[PDB]
């Protein structure tokens, strides 16, 4: 029942790195890089830095023990990025979309 619900767990995430979802999901893909994106402040404000590869890593790995610690992965990926940017940043309408596709994929697990 684990294993079935990380197997549905694993194609949210297929998902969320797809076509179908890049206009949105690009910023998501890799681990946030302060100094390239000359945001040196982020660390001292976002003390658990998440990212897409970062779950896939994880799940790969068998790192999850359950369905629940995946799905709080990717909040704390969407909720850094509230908790970081001005709320009319462009970034932030995108997580919102992309957290949109999220939340109704994990509700409607089997």
Known sequence: KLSEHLRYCDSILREMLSKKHAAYAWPFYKPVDA????????????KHPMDLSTVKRKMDGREYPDAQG???????????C????????????????????????FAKMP
């Open 35 to 46: 100094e390239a994106l000359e945001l040196h402040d982020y660390h001292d404000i976002i």
């Open 70 to 80: 995946f799905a709080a992965d990717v909040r704390l990926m969407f909720s850094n």
């Open 82 to 105: 509230y908790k970081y940017n001005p709320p009319d940043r462009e970034v932030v309408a995108m997580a919102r979309k992309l957290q949109d596709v999220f939340e109704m994929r």
